[PDB]
């Protein structure tokens, strides 16, 4: 049902610095997903020009950003291309490692953790905000998945047979205690603004009730 990995170990030494670190400036994360979401769509919005069969699963090519202050949680949705399980336990490890060495270089150089997007990287840095995160995702060419991770080392890998997504992927932030200033509606809109003004898809804030 559920499978358990470990992370590449530069990905585990990579997370273990982001829990760590003292670092204040925690708000990067937003931009870092969102950037990550826009890439993703960017790269359906590109596949479908070749094959307009890969917008069956969806046409509108979107980041939503959903805070829940009972669960805690900062959602980012997006319809781009999302993960084949396959993504999600080899690939985004693979491709993650160059980048990992590089800032875990950087970082002991004297480089900032805004530095993280530049390095590829900029997913872990949900762990800045998160103890736990939750990815739901969803490929044309394969079934949808839940990877789950609180960091310490190790994922998990299942597939999610819960509302399905059409494609695309949405990570769940089980936000800190101590950071739910990014549940609030003004502190959502002031990153987004501040960081990612210049992202090509619409970016609709879900206002809690
Ligand atoms: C810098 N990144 C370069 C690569 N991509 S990509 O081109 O989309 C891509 C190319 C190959 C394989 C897959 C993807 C892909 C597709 C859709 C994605 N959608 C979201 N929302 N996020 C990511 C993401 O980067 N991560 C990182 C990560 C780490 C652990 C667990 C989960 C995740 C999720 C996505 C990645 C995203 C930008």
Same mark, same amino acid.
Not at 10 to 15: K, N
Not at 41 to 59: A, F, H, M, N, V
Not at 122 to 129: H, K, Q, R
């Given at each position: 049902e559920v499978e358990t990995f470990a992370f590449q170990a530069?990905?585990?030494?990579?997370?273990s610095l982001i829990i760590n670190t003292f670092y204040s400036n925690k708000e990067i994360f937003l931009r870092e997903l969102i950037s990550n979401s826009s890439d993703a *769509?960017?790269?359906?919005? $590109?596949?479908?020009?070749?094959?307009?069969?890969?917008?069956?699963?969806?046409?509108? *090519?979107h980041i939503n950003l959903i805070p829940n202050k009972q669960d805690r949680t900062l959602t980012i949705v997006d319809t781009g291309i999302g993960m084949t399980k396959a993504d999600l336990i080899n690939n985004l490890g693979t491709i993650a490692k160059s980048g990992t060495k590089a800032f875990m270089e950087?970082?002991?150089?004297? !480089?900032d953790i805004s530095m993280i997007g530049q390095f590829g990287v900029?997913? $872990?840095? !949900? $762990?800045?905000?998160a103890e736990k995160?939750?990815?739901?995702?969803? &490929?044309?060419? %394969?079934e949808q998945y839940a990877?789950?991770?609180?960091? +310490?080392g190790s994922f998990t890998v299942?597939? %999610?047979?819960?509302?399905?997504? +059409?494609? +695309?992927?949405?990570?769940?932030? &089980?936000?800190?205690?101590?950071?739910?200033?990014? *549940?609030?509606?003004?502190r959502i809109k002031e990153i987004v603004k501040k960081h990612s003004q210049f992202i090509g898809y619409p970016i609709t804030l879900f206002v809690e009730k």
């Open positions: 530069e990905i585990a030494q990579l997370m *769509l960017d790269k359906i919005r $590109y596949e479908s020009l070749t094959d307009p069969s890969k917008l069956d699963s969806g046409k509108e *090519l950087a970082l002991q150089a004297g !480089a900029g997913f $872990y840095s !949900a $762990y800045l905000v995160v939750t990815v739901i995702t969803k &490929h044309n060419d %394969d990877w789950e991770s609180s960091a +310490g299942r597939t %999610d047979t819960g509302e399905p997504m +059409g494609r +695309g992927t949405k990570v769940i932030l &089980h936000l800190k205690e101590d950071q739910t200033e990014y *549940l609030e509606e003004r």
